[PDB]
Design a protein around this motif. Structure first.
Motif, mmCIF file in Angstrom:
data_model
loop_
_atom_site.group_PDB
_atom_site.id
_atom_site.type_symbol
_atom_site.label_atom_id
_atom_site.label_comp_id
_atom_site.label_asym_id
_atom_site.label_seq_id
_atom_site.Cartn_x
_atom_site.Cartn_y
_atom_site.Cartn_z
ATOM 1 N N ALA A 44 2.152 2.294 -8.240
ATOM 2 C CA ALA A 44 1.946 0.912 -7.821
ATOM 3 C C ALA A 44 0.653 0.757 -7.030
ATOM 4 N N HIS A 45 0.056 -0.431 -7.126
ATOM 5 C CA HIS A 45 -1.153 -0.773 -6.391
ATOM 6 C C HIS A 45 -0.886 -1.723 -5.231
ATOM 7 N N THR A 46 0.373 -1.881 -4.828
ATOM 8 C CA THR A 46 0.749 -2.732 -3.708
ATOM 9 C C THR A 46 1.801 -2.022 -2.866
ATOM 10 N N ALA A 47 1.927 -2.451 -1.614
ATOM 11 C CA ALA A 47 2.909 -1.899 -0.694
ATOM 12 C C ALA A 47 3.577 -3.019 0.089
ATOM 13 N N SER A 48 4.896 -2.931 0.228
ATOM 14 C CA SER A 48 5.688 -3.915 0.952
ATOM 15 C C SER A 48 6.376 -3.248 2.134
ATOM 16 N N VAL A 49 6.366 -3.925 3.280
ATOM 17 C CA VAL A 49 7.085 -3.490 4.472
ATOM 18 C C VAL A 49 7.915 -4.665 4.965
ATOM 19 N N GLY A 50 9.194 -4.428 5.233
ATOM 20 C CA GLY A 50 10.014 -5.569 5.592
ATOM 21 C C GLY A 50 11.158 -5.209 6.509
ATOM 22 N N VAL A 51 11.831 -6.255 6.983
ATOM 23 C CA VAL A 51 13.028 -6.128 7.806
ATOM 24 C C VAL A 51 14.152 -6.903 7.137
ATOM 25 N N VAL A 52 15.298 -6.247 6.974
ATOM 26 C CA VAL A 52 16.477 -6.855 6.375
ATOM 27 C C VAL A 52 17.590 -6.853 7.412
ATOM 28 N N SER A 81 17.810 7.852 10.191
ATOM 29 C CA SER A 81 18.478 7.014 11.181
ATOM 30 C C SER A 81 17.761 7.037 12.524
ATOM 31 N N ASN A 82 16.654 7.770 12.629
ATOM 32 C CA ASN A 82 15.896 7.784 13.873
ATOM 33 C C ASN A 82 15.301 6.408 14.139
ATOM 34 N N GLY A 83 15.411 5.959 15.388
ATOM 35 C CA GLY A 83 15.069 4.587 15.678
ATOM 36 C C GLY A 83 15.985 3.647 14.908
ATOM 37 N N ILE A 84 15.371 2.610 14.342
ATOM 38 C CA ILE A 84 16.089 1.747 13.416
ATOM 39 C C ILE A 84 16.247 2.486 12.091
ATOM 40 N N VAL A 85 17.282 2.125 11.330
ATOM 41 C CA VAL A 85 17.485 2.745 10.028
ATOM 42 C C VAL A 85 16.292 2.437 9.138
ATOM 43 N N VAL A 86 15.551 3.479 8.771
ATOM 44 C CA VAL A 86 14.307 3.346 8.027
ATOM 45 C C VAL A 86 14.524 3.892 6.625
ATOM 46 N N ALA A 87 14.352 3.034 5.624
ATOM 47 C CA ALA A 87 14.504 3.407 4.224
ATOM 48 C C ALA A 87 13.165 3.244 3.521
ATOM 49 N N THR A 88 12.864 4.146 2.589
ATOM 50 C CA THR A 88 11.612 4.069 1.849
ATOM 51 C C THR A 88 11.793 4.612 0.441
ATOM 52 N N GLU A 89 11.221 3.924 -0.561
ATOM 53 C CA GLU A 89 11.200 4.369 -1.982
ATOM 54 C C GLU A 89 9.737 4.449 -2.404
ATOM 55 N N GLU A 109 11.891 8.796 -5.316
ATOM 56 C CA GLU A 109 12.981 9.248 -4.462
ATOM 57 C C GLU A 109 13.197 8.275 -3.309
ATOM 58 N N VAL A 110 14.449 8.152 -2.874
ATOM 59 C CA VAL A 110 14.836 7.252 -1.794
ATOM 60 C C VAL A 110 15.126 8.101 -0.567
ATOM 61 N N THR A 111 14.414 7.839 0.528
ATOM 62 C CA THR A 111 14.571 8.618 1.749
ATOM 63 C C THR A 111 14.917 7.695 2.907
ATOM 64 N N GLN A 112 15.973 8.049 3.640
ATOM 65 C CA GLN A 112 16.504 7.237 4.727
ATOM 66 C C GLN A 112 16.663 8.091 5.975
ATOM 67 N N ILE A 156 3.437 3.822 -0.459
ATOM 68 C CA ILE A 156 3.478 4.280 0.926
ATOM 69 C C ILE A 156 4.376 5.505 0.993
ATOM 70 N N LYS A 157 4.147 6.353 1.990
ATOM 71 C CA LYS A 157 4.971 7.542 2.157
ATOM 72 C C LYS A 157 5.954 7.359 3.307
ATOM 73 N N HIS A 158 7.134 7.969 3.162
ATOM 74 C CA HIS A 158 8.173 7.846 4.181
ATOM 75 C C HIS A 158 7.708 8.403 5.520
ATOM 76 N N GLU A 159 7.049 9.565 5.500
ATOM 77 C CA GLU A 159 6.582 10.180 6.738
ATOM 78 C C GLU A 159 5.571 9.289 7.443
#
Ligand SMILES: CCCCCCCCCCCCCCCCCC(=O)OC[C@H](COP(=O)([O-])OCC(O)COP(=O)([O-])OC[C@@H](COC(=O)CCCCCCCCCCCCCCCCC)OC(=O)CCCCCCCCCCCCCCCCC)OC(=O)CCCCCCCCCCCCCCCCC
Lengths: 430, 51
Positions: A19-27, A6-14, A1-4, A187-190
């Protein structure tokens, strides 16, 4: 599921538990279209500064991997790690890219990065023909408009830059209202939102510059002929659909109808593509492919090809454009049925690959335009809903008697004049 | 000597008006199709003598 959120910066997470890896980034919503011909290549220089030896070393000491991507409409800076250490990537991203930039813009580091980037661009411009032909196609299609600036930067402009240009661009474009924070993998959105909230992670104020001219398409051509090369590389295109158009998926399916071809693979000679029936007899080409690229303001729909048969180029172009003509008048239902499943498999691998970096880039680039991410399931029903009437309606509008853009290099002496190609966009028998 | 005198001079007016506007229309079409070569621009940058 895709969760977005708008609190703070627009934060999106899938979230993907497998998976055995996690990515965090800025676009960032700025790209090579946000720069001008005098500072062209500042984005590539920023990328190579983020990817410099000292920054990458400090990152890799903690166990993190750095990725950077520069495009027309966005810039991506991604930190990938193991699932347990996803909080450390945010700390590195805050400490290095956002809070302080004085260390990365020192004199010696800037000079070394500038000399490395100059070498890379110089090698690209001479020894990478199929991609520089596509770059010149972009540069001639959208000339005097923002979208035509090459993403790497020109050789002449990259010399004039100093650190002042870099810091000016960072001040003008690295803003809270222009950024999306993306999370992909295990990773979890919360948890991600909580981790951001614990720190400040404020980027800047806002109000990025607004461009005065919107991208426009001009029918034109550029020929870079070189007789010391063994082949001829040709890219040809028309105006396509932008992102958020109702005819986006119809465009991708019409592209999938003709597909790609490699003469040396035995299997790809038996494809249901009817175009091959005309190509195979005289070995007109070594390979071709079809593309439907979409940007924020406009798009490109066309094909690219390479060949050693330097005396039969016009036959190749003629047969390809006659196959394009068939779309408007006499496309058949079996073609569309094959195209649906081929596209679904094509879209399936793209959005469901193991590597989370591709997912992060796609999610960040998507939420910056749509405001939300389309699901895989809802994508299929629109694909399945496509009919013959829709394909005919789209083709009668986008490629029947329309201006083209051409870019070629090599032994292109056999490539005829512009008008002779332009007349092939209609049949005259109908 | 010329019993075709009147008809010759009125068929001529029809032929001249038709041909004089065909002649002008052809100049526009010639220039429209030659427009891509009339304004074509060349540049020259000497290649390096390394090769
Ligand atoms: C000197 C004249 C040189 C003209 C050269 C030329 O037109 O070449 C274009 C083009 C160059 O060939 P090509 O596009 O590489 O290959 C043939 C196309 O696939 C041809 O495929 P197409 O579908 O693009 O065109 C087929 C064409 C074929 O035309 C005929 O068969 C007639 O059909 C028509 O033209 C149908 C309409 C005819 C209306 C005639 C009006 C009354 C006179 O050739 C043609 O399309 C032939 C057109 C000939 C028209 C009649 C010319 C005058 C005859 C006396």
């Amino acid at each position: 599921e895709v969760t977005q959120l708008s609190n703070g910066i627009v934060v999106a997470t899938e979230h993907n538990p497998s998976a055995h890896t996690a990515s965090v980034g800025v676009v960032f919503g700025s790209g090579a279209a946000n720069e001008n011909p005098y500072n062209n290549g500042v984005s590539n220089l920023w990328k190579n500064i983020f990817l410099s030896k000292e920054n990458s070393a400090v990152a890799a000491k903690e166990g993190l991997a750095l990725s950077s991507n520069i495009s027309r409409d966005f810039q991506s800076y991604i930190v990938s790690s193991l699932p347990g250490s996803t909080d450390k990537s945010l700390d590195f991203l805050n400490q290095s890219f956002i809070q302080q930039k004085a260390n990365l813009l020192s004199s010696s580091n800037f000079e070394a990065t500038k000399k490395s980037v100059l070498k890379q661009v110089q090698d690209f411009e001479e020894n990478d023909h199929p991609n520089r032909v596509l770059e010149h196609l972009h540069s001639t299609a959208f000339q005097n408009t923002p979208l035509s600036l090459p993403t790497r930067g020109t050789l002449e402009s990259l010399e004039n830059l100093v650190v002042a240009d870099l810091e000016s661009f960072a001040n003008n474009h690295f803003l809270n209202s222009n950024a999306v924070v993306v999370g992909t993998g295990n990773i979890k959105h919360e948890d991600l939102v909580n981790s951001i909230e614990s720190k400040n992670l404020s980027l800047q104020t806002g109000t990025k510059p607004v461009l005065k001219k919107k991208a426009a398409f001009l029918g034109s051509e550029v020929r870079l002929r070189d007789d010391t090369l063994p082949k001829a590389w040709i890219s040809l295109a028309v105006e396509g659909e932008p992102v958020n158009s109702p005819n986006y998926f119809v465009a991708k399916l019409a592209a999938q109808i003709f597909g790609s071809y490699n003469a040396f693979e035995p299997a790809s000679r038996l494809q249901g593509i009817k175009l091959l029936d005309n190509i195979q007899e005289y070995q007109l080409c070594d390979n071709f492919n079809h593309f439907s690229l979409s940007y924020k303001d406009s798009g490109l729909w066309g094909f690219s090809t390479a060949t050693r048969n330097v005396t039969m180029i016009d036959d190749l172009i003629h047969f390809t454009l006659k196959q394009w003509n068939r779309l408007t008048i006499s496309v058949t239902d079996t073609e569309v049925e094959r195209a649906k499943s081929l596209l679904k498999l094509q879209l399936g691998q793209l959005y469901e690959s193991g590597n989370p970096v591709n997912d992060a880039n796609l999610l960040g680039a998507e939420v910056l335009i749509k405001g939300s991410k389309l699901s895989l399931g809802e994508a299929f029903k629109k694909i399945d809903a496509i009919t013959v009437k829709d394909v005919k309606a789209w083709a009668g509008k986008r490629l029947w008697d329309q201006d083209i853009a051409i870019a070629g290099t090599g032994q292109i002496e056999g490539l005829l004049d512009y008008m002779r190609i332009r007349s092939d966009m209609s049949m005259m028998r109908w | 000597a010329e019993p075709e005198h009147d008809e010759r001079k009125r068929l001529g007016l029809k032929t001249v008006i038709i041909l004089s506007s065909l002649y002008l229309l052809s100049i526009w079409v010639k220039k429209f199709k030659w427009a891509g070569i009339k304004t074509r621009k060349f540049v020259f940058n000497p290649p390096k003598p390394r090769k």
